[PDB]
Design a protein around this ligand. Structure first.
Ligand SMILES: COc1cc(OC)c2c(=O)cc(-c3cc(C)c(OC[C@H](O)CN4CCN(C)CC4)c(C)c3)oc2c1
Length: 126
């Protein structure tokens, strides 16, 4: 069985909409979301359909771009670093669970290269 997905809504968590967070949605997430390798990362890993009974025994902090997209659209974050960590968690989970040469790993690295190139020009806070 799959665990419940990460939280995307929490009304007692403080939130805001900084220009950095707008950039993470409009530049960073949109760039990765449209990429040819985005599809495995657009929703939580469905370990049941994929028949990976051990995935959520090894991956204790799941994350994915569907969760990140909902969080940005919901203005769930307080700062840019919370959102950047989610991306890095999602990439790291992939490298942690899988074999170094795997397709899913190459897909992850292609998205992460773009991720790094975009956050390198993260604007200073307005
Ligand atoms: C869709 O979205 C995502 C997103 C993901 O991360 C974002 C991942 C991910 O992390 C890795 C896997 C995955 C890994 C193996 C190893 C596998 O293969 C298991 C199969 O039973 C056959 N192999 C078993 C091992 N035997 C040695 C050889 C055969 C399958 C089907 C998927 O899928 C993902 C899908």
């Amino acid at each position: 069985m799959n665990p419940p997905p990460p939280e995307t809504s929490n009304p007692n968590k403080p939130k805001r909409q900084t220009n950095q967070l707008q950039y993470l949605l409009r530049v960073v997430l949109k760039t990765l979301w449209k990429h040819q390798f985005a599809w495995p990362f657009q929703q939580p890993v469905d370990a049941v359909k994929l028949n990976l009974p051990d995935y959520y025994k090894i991956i204790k902090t799941p994350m994915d771009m569907g969760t990140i997209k909902k969080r940005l659209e919901n203005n769930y974050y307080w700062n840019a670093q919370e959102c950047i960590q989610d991306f890095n968690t999602m990439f790291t989970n992939c490298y942690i669970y899988n074999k170094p040469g795997d397709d899913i790993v190459l897909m992850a690295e292609a998205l992460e290269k773009l991720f790094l190139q975009k956050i390198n020009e993260l604007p200073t806070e307005e």
